[PDB]
């Protein structure tokens, strides 16, 4: 159903890409301490024009905030009814001025002190957006650690048109235990030390809280993560290996020129792709056409309302990943 594509201006949005999306979410605009939104960058502006020109049905939205963005500023703007009201008016004015069709609130992350005020902010923002038909979404966290204290999912659901669930970054630069999958679909069987660092657990968490699952999008990544100097498996399964050193996040479009993709191992239980290169001891966890196909099937099977992608511009020139997901 929905194909919600985040876009961060790595490269121009192509006319083929625009036709494969229902929603294009430019990323990012950030508010200052007074609720003034940063102006749309040139690369984001171009993608808006390219998307609308190539797909008259496409909704082009601005994601406000982001993983880099200080969540205490969201707290400040939303907690005060006066600043909440003016921030909302600034958002609505920003949409009209920049010819946008709506916005995504990417607040990473609301704390327990934010839980109710986040819902109030989204409900009020929806009310101001409703006459123009502007589309409202938010990005949701992937673990109970964040979800339980900070996310009133029923309340959020009552306000937004859909929820973009960030089912990725399950392992990363903070991981001290072992290598592991950035975005597996499932727990990876008996060798998996975790029940929850997978998309299925995160989506099931949301399914158990929200009224209408059609309002959920399962997020998928078009990027992967690498480690170097990686050693032996911890418990007989090559996905979880003795740590060397965190590498970086790589866009899919850049993996094939640095890794021999013919060495891809596809985990049959977790539904996730990785490469361990015994020659170099480099390790890459990523998503590829196979993992994305399995995830689209999961979404259809569970009746989830859509797929969201971070980020479509990380795809290769031939749209291997976007063509696989839809
Ligand atoms: C997905 O998660 C649910 C609930 O956590 C669990 O019952 C189910 O077995 C999981 N599916 C797979 C294939 O791991």
CATH 3.40.190.170 fits 2-222+287-325, yes or no: no
Q: Is the dihedral of CA 73, 76, 79, 85 positive or negative?
A: negative
Q: Tell me the C-alpha distance between 225 and 240, whole Å.
A: 14
Q: Residue written as tokens 């980020």?
A: 311
Q: How far is the CA of 295 from the centre of ligand 1 (A)?
A: 14
Q: Tell me the C-alpha distance between 219 and 61, whole Å.
A: 16
Q: Which of 204, 208, 295, 304 to mutate to test the pocket of ligand 1 (most atoms within 8 A of CB)?
A: 204
Question: And the tokens for 111?
Answer: 């704390």
Domain segments of the chain: what residues?
Answer: 2-222+287-325
Q: How far is the CA of 208 from the centre of ligand 1 (A)?
A: 13
CA 269 to ligand 1: nearest atom: 13
CA 195 to ligand 1: nearest atom: 5
Decide: 192 and 233 in contact? Cβ < 8 Å.
Answer: no
End-to-end CA distance of the chain: 9
CA 187 to ligand 1: nearest atom: 14
Closest Cα to atom 13, ligand 1: which residue?
186
Q: Tell me the C-alpha distance between 181 and 285, whole Å.
A: 5
Residue count (the chain): 326
Residues contacting 304, CB < 8 A, separation 6+: 203, 207, 213, 214, 216, 217, 218, 298
Q: Tell me the C-alpha distance between 90 and 32, whole Å.
A: 12
Closest Cα to atom 12, ligand 1: which residue?
186
Q: Tell me the C-alpha distance between 308 and 206, whole Å.
A: 15
Identify the DSSP state of 96.
H
Reduced to 3 states, what is the DSSP secondary structure of residue 1?
Answer: coil
CA 186 to ligand 1: nearest atom: 14
Q: How far is the CA of 3 from the centre of ligand 1 (A)?
A: 24
Pocket of ligand 1 (CB under 6 A): 186-187, 200-201, 204
Task: Provide the H-helix boundaries in the chain.
Answer: 15-19, 42-54, 71-79, 81-97, 115-129, 144-150, 153-159, 199-209, 252-255, 289-302, 320-325
Task: Give the relative orientation of helices 71-79 and 115-129 as an angle to the nearest 10 degrees.
Answer: 70
Closest Cα to atom 14, ligand 1: which residue?
186
Q: Which of 187, 189, 269 to mutate to test the pocket of ligand 1 (most atoms within 8 A of CB)?
A: 187
Provide the phi-psi class of 23: left if phi over 0, else alpha when psi is between -120 and 50, else beta. beta
Q: How far is the CA of 113 from the centre of ligand 1 (A)?
A: 31
Q: How far is the CA of 187 from the centre of ligand 1 (A)?
A: 8
Burial of 300 (0-12, 13-18, 19+ CB in 10 A): exposed
Q: Is the dihedral of CA 203, 16, 13, 128 positive or negative?
A: negative
Q: How far is the CA of 201 from the centre of ligand 1 (A)?
A: 7
Q: How far is the CA of 270 from the centre of ligand 1 (A)?
A: 11
Q: How far is the CA of 186 from the centre of ligand 1 (A)?
A: 7
Q: How far is the CA of 314 from the centre of ligand 1 (A)?
A: 29
Q: Which of 186, 191, 297 to mutate to test the pocket of ligand 1 (most atoms within 8 A of CB)?
A: 186
Compute the C-alpha angle 108/171/176, nearest 5°: 110
CA 200 to ligand 1: nearest atom: 1
Q: How far is the CA of 87 from the centre of ligand 1 (A)?
A: 40
Decide: 200 and 186 in contact? Cβ < 8 Å.
Answer: yes
Q: Residue written as tokens 């040139």?
A: 42
Reduced to 3 states, what is the DSSP secondary structure of residue 257?
Answer: coil
Q: Tell me the C-alpha distance between 194 and 302, whole Å.
A: 22
């Amino acid at each position: 159903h929905r194909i919600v594509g985040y876009y961060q201006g790595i490269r121009p949005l192509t006319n083929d890409q625009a036709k494969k999306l229902t929603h294009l979410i430019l990323a990012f605009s950030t508010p200052d301490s007074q609720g003034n939104l940063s102006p749309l960058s040139s690369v984001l502006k171009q993608a808006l024009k390219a998307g609308k020109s190539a797909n008259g049905a496409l909704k082009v939205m601005i994601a406000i905030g982001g993983g880099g963005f200080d969540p205490a500023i969201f707290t400040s703007l939303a907690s005060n009814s006066g600043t909440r009201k003016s921030f909302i008016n600034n958002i609505v004015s920003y949409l009209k001025t920049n010819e946008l069709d709506g916005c995504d609130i990417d607040w990473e992350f609301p704390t327990s002190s934010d839980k109710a005020i986040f819902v109030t902010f989204l409900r009020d923002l929806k009310k101001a957006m409703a006459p123009s038909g502007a589309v409202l979404s938010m990005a949701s966290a992937a673990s109970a650690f964040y979800l339980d204290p900070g996310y009133d999912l029923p309340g959020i659901e009552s306000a937004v048109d859909f929820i973009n669930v960030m089912c990725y970054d399950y392992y990363g630069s903070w991981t001290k235990t072992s290598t592991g999958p950035n975005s597996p679909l499932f727990k990876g069987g008996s060798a998996d030390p975790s029940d929850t660092l997978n998309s299925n657990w995160t989506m099931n968490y949301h399914l158990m809280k929200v009224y209408n699952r059609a309002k959920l999008n399962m997020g998928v990544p078009f990027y992967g993560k690498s480690w170097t100097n990686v050693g032996a498996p911890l418990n007989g399964d090559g996905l979880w290996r003795q740590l060397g050193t965190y590498g970086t996040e790589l866009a899919w479009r850049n993996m094939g020129k640095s890794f021999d993709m013919t060495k891809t191992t596809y985990h049959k239980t977790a539904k996730t792709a990785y490469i361990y290169d015994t020659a170099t001891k480099n390790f890459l966890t990523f998503d590829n056409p196979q993992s994305l196909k399995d995830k689209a099937k999961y979404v259809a099977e569970k009746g989830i309302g859509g797929i969201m992608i971070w980020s479509i511009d990380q795809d290769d020139d031939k749209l291997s990943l976007l063509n696989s997901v839809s």
